[PDB]
C-alpha cells in the first residue's frame, strides 16, 4: 500500500490559505523521495527533524496541508512568527516537528486578467490558536456601531483577494505551500519508508 503523496503535491487548485484542507495520512509506506524529486523548491525548511533522515523514522500520524500564498509570506510559515498569514490564517505551534516545503508555481495560477479565486483573511478579533481553521464570512466590526450584516462604513469583509497575475515580482507571484506535520506518541508506528 503506497502513500498518497503525488495526489497532495500534483493536485490542481490548491485551497486558499484561509480554508486550508488537512489530508491526514495513515496506513502507508511513505517514501519521502517523490517529494524531493518534484520541482526546485523555493524553501525546504524542516523544523524538529533532519530532512535527510525522514526516510527512516516511523511516526504515528502525518498531516499535509495545501496553501496558495504570496512569495514574501512563505517566511511566516514557521514556529514563533507573526504577520498577516501566521496570525489570522495559519498558526504553526511553537514545538512544530515537520517541513515547510514551498514551490514557486506561477504558470498555473495568476491568470492574465487576474486570479481572484485565492482569498486570505486579514481581519480577526484575536490571533489564531495553533492549528485552527476559521472559515467565517461574518462582517468584521472594525468600528463601534454594530454592523448587523451590511458592509457599511467601519464594517469590512475579512477575506481579501490576492489578485495574482503573471506580471508581479518574484516576491508576489503565487506560491504553493505544503507543510507536513508528524506526530509520534504511544500508538504503534504506522508510517515510514522501506528502511526502518
Amino acid at each position, epitope marked *: 500500500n503506497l502513500c498518497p503523496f503525488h495526489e497532495v503535491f500534483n493536485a490542481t487548485t490548491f485551497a486558499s490559505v484561509y480554508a486550508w484542507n488537512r489530508k491526514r495520512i495513515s496506513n502507508c509506506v511513505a517514501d519521502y523521495s517523490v517529494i524531493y524529486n518534484f520541482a526546485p523548491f523555493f524553501a525546504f525548511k524542516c523544523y524538529g527533524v533532519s530532512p535527510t533522515k525522514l526516510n527512516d523514522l516511523c511516526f504515528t500520524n502525518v498531516y499535509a496541508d495545501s496553501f496558495v500564498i504570496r512569495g514574501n509570506e512563505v517566511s511566516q510559515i514557521a514556529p514563533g512568527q*507573526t*504577520g498577516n498569514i501566521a*496570525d489570522y490564517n495559519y498558526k504553526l505551534p511553537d514545538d512544530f516537528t515537520g517541513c515547510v516545503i514551498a514551490w514557486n508555481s506561477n504558470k498555473l495560477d495568476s491568470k492574465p486578467s487576474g486570479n481572484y479565486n485565492y482569498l486570505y483573511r486579514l481581519f*480577526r478579533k*484575536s490571533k489564531l490558536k495553533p492549528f485552527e481553521r476559521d472559515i467565517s464570512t461574518e462582517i468584521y466590526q472594525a*468600528g*463601534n456601531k454594530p454592523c448587523n450584516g451590511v458592509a457599511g462604513p*467601519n464594517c469590512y469583509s475579512p477575506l481579501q483577494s490576492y489578485g495574482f*497575475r503573471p*506580471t508581479y515580482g518574484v516576491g508576489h507571484q503565487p506560491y504553493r505551500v505544503v507543510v507536513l506535520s508528524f506526530e509520534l506518541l504511544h500508538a504503534p508506528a504506522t508510517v515510514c519508508g522501506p528502511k526502518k
Partner: antibody
Amino acid sequence: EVQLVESGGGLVQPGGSLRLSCAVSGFTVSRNYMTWARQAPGKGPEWVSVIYPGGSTFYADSVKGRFTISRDSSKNILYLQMNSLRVDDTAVYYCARDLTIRGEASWGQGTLVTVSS
Amino acid sequence: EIVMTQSPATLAVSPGERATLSCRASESFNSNLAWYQQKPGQAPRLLIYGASTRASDVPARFSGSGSGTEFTLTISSVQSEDFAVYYCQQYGDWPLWTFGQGTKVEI
C-alpha cells in the same frame, strides 16, 4: 468623521525619552491596523511602527529596539514610547488607520518632534 | 525594499491645463500603488488607491493608470487648489509601504 489628535511633541535632548499620545475618535484602536508614520521636513513620509488588531507589532529597521508601540482600548488611545532618541529622528509624526487596500486611509494632524543640543 | 522615485520634481502648470505626473519603481510589485496629495501644513490625503481606482470624495479629474513599474497620475484640469505635493506610495507589502519624494505642482 474619523479624527486623530497627536500629543507629546516637543524638544528633547539626544538620548532622551518621549511619549507620544494619540486620541482617536470614530472607531476602536484595538480592532484596526494602526501605523505611526514619520515625515522628515524635507522628504516624503516614512513608516516607523505598526500594530495589528491582534497584538503583533512591527518596527522599521532604523528604529527597531528603541520605540515601543502600545494601545489602550479603555480610553481608545495609541501610545508610542521614544527611547535613545537621536538628532536624526527630528520630524513630524502622524497616526494612521492605514487600511489602504480598502481605500480608507485617515491620517492625524501630527506633532513636531525636535531633537537637538 | 522597493524604492520609489517620481519625476519631474518641480512640475509647473497653469490653472485649467492638464498635468501628467509619473512614478517609477525599482522592482515589480503586486499592483498596489496609491497616489497621495499633501497640502502644506496638512497630513497626506488618499487620492488614488490600487493605481487605477479613486477613493471617496475624490473629484473625477484625478485618474491613475499604468502597471508594472511605471505609474502615471493624470489631472484633467487643475483649478486653483490642486497645487500641492503628490506622492506615490507602494503598499505591496501592506501594512508596510514606502513613499515617493515629492512632485510639488507650482502655479
